[PDB]
Design a protein around this nucleic acid. Structure first.
Ligand SMILES: [Cl-]
Ligand SMILES: [Mg+2]
Ligand SMILES: [Mn+2]
Ligand code: NA
Length: 325
DNA sequence: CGGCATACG
DNA sequence: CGTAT
DNA sequence: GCCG
């Protein structure tokens, strides 16, 4: 089992679901406390289990696996022996975990904002509503739409949204294309947001495109909220006899950069962190959603496909469906 | 022990 | 500070 | 929290 998640296939569904979910509770809790190192190790240990070909049934099967030390192994040991891990259950029950989770789920609220509200004594969404002078307009949107945004987006919803986005993109710039990215491109059947990547086959034609797209969507009455290359929107999506608010992210890239942006926006988030870490630490190349830089030659790698990029980095190619780290 | 991904709004 | 993967 |  290699040590980096980008070095191994990770399917969407797997054989250690319970064990990985427990570790990911501890990762999330570490994040709420500002401990990014411990978050990362628990995330990585969870991801290793997702990559295994069968269920872990005994503690000895952890021997030799990367990212499994005293703490993560103990978590698994307790789950194997008793069906529950006391530490994990304590986190789950805690007022701190539950409130930080509730608050950071709001669009516009991060760990630092959640933490300050927690420390001021706030606990509930209605606590926040009763003091709206304390909220940004982004947070106000996030709070008004919180119920709808908490309901999973389905793949049927995605196809309807894609047709709508293509229509506006087509008026804004004939020939521009719309590609589904994010978790749905990895094969997820549900999600909490839809991600699209927009480009045009003629380099440079995409300059200034996103404002033109947003103006057109707004004119069609589709935009409940938005604030450039990236747009984080709340869309009005048709429902039987009504509609619901859906988070949609729109990203534009020049076609020269499209493979990098496609790779970068298709995720998973842990997969991208591990791939960038691998690039820099193992190959000495600097990766982002724009390009891949050799800091010795001071040159950028030209890529025509995601396949090109995996080959550049000396990694076996992984389709999106195997990037669910 | 240092490091932990890398951007844009 | 927030957002994204 | 774990790797190297
Ligand atoms: Cl980036
Ligand atoms: Mg997404
Ligand atoms: Mn998104
Ligand atoms: Na949030």
């Amino acid at each position: 089992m290699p040590a980096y998640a980008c070095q191994r296939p990770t399917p969407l569904t797997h054989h250690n679901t319970g064990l990985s979910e427990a570790l990911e509770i501890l990762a999330e809790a570490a994040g709420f406390e500002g401990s990014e190192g411990r978050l990362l190790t628990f995330c990585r240990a969870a991801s290793v289990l997702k990559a295994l070909p069968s269920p872990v049934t005994t503690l000895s099967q952890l021997q030799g696996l990367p990212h499994f030390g005293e703490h993560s192994s103990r978590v698994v040991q307790e789950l194997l022996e008793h069906g529950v891990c006391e530490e994990v259950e304590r986190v789950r029950r805690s007022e701190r975990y539950q409130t930080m989770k509730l608050f950071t789920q709001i669009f516009g609220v991060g760990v630092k904002t959640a933490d300050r509200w927690y420390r001021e004594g706030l606990r509930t969404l209605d606590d926040l509503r009763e003091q709206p002078q304390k909220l940004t307009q982004q947070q106000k949107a996030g709070l008004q739409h919180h119920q709808d945004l908490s309901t999973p987006v389905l793949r049927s919803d995605v196809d309807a949204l894609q047709q709508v986005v293509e229509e506006a993109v087509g008026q804004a710039l004939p020939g521009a294309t719309v590609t589904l990215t994010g978790g749905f491109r990895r094969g997820k059947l549900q999600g909490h947001d839809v991600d699209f990547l927009i480009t045009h086959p003629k380099e440079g034609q995409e300059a200034g495109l996103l404002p033109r797209v947003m103006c057109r969507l707004q004119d069609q009455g589709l935009i409940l909220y938005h604030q450039f290359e990236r747009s984080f929107c709340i869309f009005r999506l048709p429902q039987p006899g009504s509609w619901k608010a859906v988070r949609v992210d729109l990203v534009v890239a020049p076609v020269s950069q499209f493979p990098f942006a496609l790779l970068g926006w298709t995720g998973s988030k842990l997969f991208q962190r591990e791939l960038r870490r691998f690039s820099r630490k193992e190959k000495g190349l600097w990766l982002n959603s724009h390009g891949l830089f050799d800091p010795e030659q001071k040159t950028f790698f030209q890529a025509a496909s995601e396949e090109d990029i995996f080959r550049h980095l000396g990694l076996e190619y992984l389709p999106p469906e195997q990037r669910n780290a």
